[PDB]
Paper text:
PNGM-1 is derived from a metagenomic library from deep-sea sediments that predate the antibiotic era. PNGM-1 has both MBL and tRNase Z activities and is considered to be the evolutionary origin of B3 MBLs. The wild-type of PNGM-1 has two MBSs in its substrate-binding pocket, and each is occupied by a zinc ion. The zinc ion in the first MBS (Zn1) is coordinated by the residues His91, His93, His188, and Asp210; the zinc ion in the second MBS (Zn2), by Asp95, His96, His279, and Asp210.
His91 and His93 coordinate the zinc ion at Zn1, whereas His96 and His279 coordinate that at Zn2. In the crystal structures of the H96A and H279A variants, the electron density of the zinc ion at Zn2 is markedly lower compared to that in the wild-type structure, indicating that either a water molecule with full occupancy or a zinc ion with half occupancy is present in this site. In H96A, even though electron density exists for the zinc ion at Zn2, the density is weak and noisy, implying weak binding of the metal ion. Among all the variants, H91A and H96A exhibit the lowest metal occupancy. From a structural viewpoint, the substitution of His91 and His96 by alanine markedly weakens the metal binding affinity for Zn1 and Zn2, respectively, compared to that of the wild-type and the remaining variants. The residues His91 and His96 are buried in the substrate-binding pocket of PNGM-1. In the structures of all PNGM-1 variants, except in that of H96A, the electron density corresponding to the catalytic water remains despite the complete or partial loss of a zinc ion. Each MBS of PNGM-1 is formed by four metal-coordinating residues, and the substitution of only one of these residues dramatically reduces the metal binding affinity of the enzyme.
Author numbering:
A (entry chain D), B (entry chain A), C (entry chain B), D (entry chain C): 9 to 373
The structure:
Amino acid sequence: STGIAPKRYVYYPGSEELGPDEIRVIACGTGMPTARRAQAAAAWVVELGNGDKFIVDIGSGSMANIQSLMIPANYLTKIFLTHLHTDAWGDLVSMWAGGWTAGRTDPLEVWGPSGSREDMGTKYAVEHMLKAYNWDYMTRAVTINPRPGDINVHEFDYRALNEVVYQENGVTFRSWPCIHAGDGPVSFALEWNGYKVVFGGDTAPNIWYPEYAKGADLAIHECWMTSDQMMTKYNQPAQLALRINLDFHTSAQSFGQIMNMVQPRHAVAYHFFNDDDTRYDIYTGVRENYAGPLSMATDMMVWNITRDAVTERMAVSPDHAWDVAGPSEDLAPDRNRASEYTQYILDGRLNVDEANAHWKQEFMG
Amino acid sequence: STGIAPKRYVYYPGSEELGPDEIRVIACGTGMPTARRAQAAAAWVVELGNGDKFIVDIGSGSMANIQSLMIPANYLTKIFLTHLHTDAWGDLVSMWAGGWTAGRTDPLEVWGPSGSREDMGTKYAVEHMLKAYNWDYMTRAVTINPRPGDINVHEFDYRALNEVVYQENGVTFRSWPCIHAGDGPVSFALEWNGYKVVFGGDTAPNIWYPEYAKGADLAIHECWMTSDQMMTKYNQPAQLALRINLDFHTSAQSFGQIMNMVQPRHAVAYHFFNDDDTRYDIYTGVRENYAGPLSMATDMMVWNITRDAVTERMAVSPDHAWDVAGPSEDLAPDRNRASEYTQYILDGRLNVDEANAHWKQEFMG
Amino acid sequence: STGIAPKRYVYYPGSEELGPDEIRVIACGTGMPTARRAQAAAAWVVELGNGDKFIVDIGSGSMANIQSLMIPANYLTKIFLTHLHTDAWGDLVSMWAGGWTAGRTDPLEVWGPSGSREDMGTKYAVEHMLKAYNWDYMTRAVTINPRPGDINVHEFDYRALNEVVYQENGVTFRSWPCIHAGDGPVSFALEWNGYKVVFGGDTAPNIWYPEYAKGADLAIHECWMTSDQMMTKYNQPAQLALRINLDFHTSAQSFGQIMNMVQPRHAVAYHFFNDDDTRYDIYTGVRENYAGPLSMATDMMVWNITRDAVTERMAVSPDHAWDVAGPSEDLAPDRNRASEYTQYILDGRLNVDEANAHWKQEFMG
Amino acid sequence: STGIAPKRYVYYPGSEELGPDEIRVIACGTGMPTARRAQAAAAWVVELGNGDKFIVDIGSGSMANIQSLMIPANYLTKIFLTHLHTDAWGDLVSMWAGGWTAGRTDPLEVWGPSGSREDMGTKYAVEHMLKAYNWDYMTRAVTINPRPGDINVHEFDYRALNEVVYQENGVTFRSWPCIHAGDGPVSFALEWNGYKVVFGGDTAPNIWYPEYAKGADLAIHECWMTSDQMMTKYNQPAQLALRINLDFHTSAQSFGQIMNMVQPRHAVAYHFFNDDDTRYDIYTGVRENYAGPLSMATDMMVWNITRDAVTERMAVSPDHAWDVAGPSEDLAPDRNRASEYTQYILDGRLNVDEANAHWKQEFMG
Ligand SMILES: [Zn+2]
Ligand SMILES: [Zn+2]
Ligand SMILES: [Zn+2]
Ligand SMILES: [Zn+2]
């Protein structure tokens, strides 16, 4: 009566203790290159039982969903990018900037593939994102000590076949290639404490995923909208709309083929618009070849991985979100940085003393 | 009975004809550097009765709201940036890539301010952004004509006092400085067909906005959360919370003084968390010194400016947004372009012919 | 550019003219006798191209949706009830009082079935409803003309096999029995201009629906949650979950059998929780036997029925709904209506003339 | 990191153990006679540290919000009605029928006022409500035990001044007249453990509320839209728009004056449409005379009453709500009780054996 309701049928972010032998995966974006309030672009939050937390992809729009988990910014410092599509990493800037004012005190750590040359790789990309936002950076840095505005980039060969790219505190990430637009993109396997979660990213059907994702607890893979849907919605000629499901993208039928090969405890289809008139065709495509546990992902779906089961719930999270304070500590600023104001601009100040008099007076007692 | 409901109490994007002597302004972001599903970072869509349209600021998260307006990518090629904060242009990338895969045939045109030196200006910011996303650009330009993957930058002097920065088809944008983090930030005024709309951007109270926003049909200005609210939501020390409303940002009372001076037909307050326990005190603050027509901005608020009236209303728009096709032509992909695939990645294609045979044959008829 | 978007991918209620050979059906509730913000209890609004409009069912909570369609109360006076579940006609009371404050000028017309005896029928039910709300009726009628507060009831015989219960202006409703908890429940067929819409109400699988619903433009039918689901969600013993889907309700597999028999242009399944982890099994259940066009119903779904197609879309409507005014002229109150105030209560009034002095001067010019 | 985020900024229903010296109050409706997904008609949940729970009003729409709180049906048995408006008790039926099917064990208890004669009181109201829903009552009593279908009514004298109408377990409700549409409406005071909560219900300014609601921890009173907002929305003439805020309802200005008198810890305004262009004018009305803590209510607003603070939050709760089981027992049917089917109806059962055998088999194994 006055007690707490156990095993809730929805995930309320911040309301639940994580078990030492438990993973929590939250889809903070499941969408497309088209922006949509119901679906941010691809983003995954992993919370391990040992207190380690990772983001895999941080697409355009995902930061709103990520900020809604009531997780302090200092705990969301490690970011893996499958690839360098705006719809895979475009909110990294919002996580760099917003997280910093939210009181991150550590640099961002970013693991992402190379390309076929320096300027098609993750290091080039991050380096120039930081030059793009130089004004934000210098103006911020005069006051706030600049350490957390660092991004340490760990680039790995996109070509490598299931090679470790991260080994720390009992946690392994391995990568392997995808086939998606051009050379560069990868899939991630996260291994910890008996478990294995697989982040496909984006790819046409490839020989590497079905091999290295085998027997995962949670397998995530591109599952595209049908050729019929492509023709109804984007008004594509049948030949173009066919090509999209065979050459550019993993079809639902293809997705089911791969998860039949993988044999996960739980499969996840993402990277399609989950509407009242698309999802059923795509579910049917999958079920042609795969009959095991299947999630049809949308924004703020959550997976609990225990020894017993893989549980799918929806997260009920605050739309009117706020930064939530962490156990970190005020770092000691930098009184050796050059101010970015001229006196021509500071001579613009408006005398507002008389309008602010009444509230300024009550406020100081 | 069978008839369209005229002068509807909410705005349905795509449902109304825009009159030739009418302007329509929609707030696609009203929020803060903290992400929130309820409020994107700053973005304004402006629609003139002569068919000209404009985005003023395109902050982190605004793209979902902009795509909810059912406006073809080709009609939204022109972007004005008040300043180079993540939360004022972080989504220029989503508009670039998105509008390109959605059928934008023309390059993006971008106006923003210079800084005190090259690497503090818009020219440098956008140049290094295109480099940041070079993997996206080069891959996409293989399959899709590259001309609309261009961004033509129009850098204007941030120091200029109320000087034109755009003039085209009887439309003028003027700029004047803001006082905000460091040199470069501006406010804009759009002058067309007897009308004046002011976009304040981000600023502590300054002597220029009161002078140059005078007699505006719609006046927009930063209006910050109360010091008491700074000390409650974030747990600041009194001093730091006082300084924020007296030095770093415009207080409600300040906003009130400025709009008192400006005597706009209609004034808009934005850039605070519009919540059921914040908005009222901020409202009371404005009303200390300003008694005129006022909107307290939140996401998808819209203003109709006619000779007779300045109407405020809410837009009711699809969360499940799709791109909408515009009048323009198919453009031809440049075939003198090297693949970004090596044979090593392409040798990974999976045989999926069988799994896909069922739907495949049915679709070719 | 300044024009309307044609054939929009979502329905904006109030924004689209109905053709003279066109029907529009909006699901205003698709849920259970359990309350849910995301699904109201059963309710349908039918709009014919000839100007006539009808509600079939008005279950608990449906009114907030019906009010969102921006339809004047004076156009929504004709209500047919499939049966007498709270979850089938619970919001009749809200349509009765709400419509009347908001300027309905004609009486409500209700068609509902008889039962096995007097006190199991719509006549008894509505006579005693009006008694329950006698305080509301008498207090409202001092001030507003009592005529719109009349309910004319049209009790049809629940036993009749596919017999006319309404025939006016080229429109026909037939009824036939359901098997649902107790004698009384019916399904209806609306016939107009060569269109046939079937409102299944609630039923266990019966021999009448497949016969009388055959060749429907749009066929609607109960489609219950699976026996696995009933156990998972509600904590059921194995053999009671089995009984729900074979005796009490129409299983998804049965729904497929019926719609296989009916061969409609479009079948609609409804009266199940449409959730991210219920919908897909239900859909696969139907698909075992029925292959034709299907909608899995949710709240605010809309079908456009033309000669050429049956289109499913989602309605996008104001959560902040208001009454909308219809042309219908003024209606003169009574001065043969006793006040319901005694002077004991009326002597309780508070002097507030001075607290209201400021805005009461300002307002009288 | 693996911890639970404490003293959280949103209330997640089901997630917070209630303190023994604490009251929790949720607005489950705040609306008008007009239906709206944003605002249910008036409803209030009170939870007490002794584990007693209470509903005060249960207006049309409210049940969807009540069910979102994840409270078992069996702990929600006691309803107090301020008055007999459809928008104050229209969803009692929904709590009656819906609780019962979800394992409520005890009858509902209902406390409402009498009127000037039997047919204007709560005993008469509820008696005829049960007759109205006789079919539903009689059919449900065949397959589930009939006792939780009962509604034990406690009618009290509306005219009484501050008299005890409930007295159990250290909890005490008092009532006093309102002036609302006609004789019969009241306000409640809930007194428990040195806390006073006051439920305004609906009234024009009266001499009883200020007297009897003095020293209230939480104090709730009608507060109406402005005359200007009445003229603009409902196309009123000038004089009738004036009569509404002086005679029939309590103005913002009068809400101020009355709350100035009562000097509660925390004042609540409700019964106005809480919209981005209405609420502000209403805030400013109330602050002409009241400067104490003030909530402008909307659906799912919650107050925590502790010794130290009256804390406002917003509840973030599932739209896709479900019943949660309580510790109550599995109560048993009745064979005595006569079936409500005739052989005429059962003779209509369709044979669906072949359709259902495949799922029927796998369920039993
Ligand atoms: Zn991609
Ligand atoms: Zn800024
Ligand atoms: Zn029923
Ligand atoms: Zn009332």
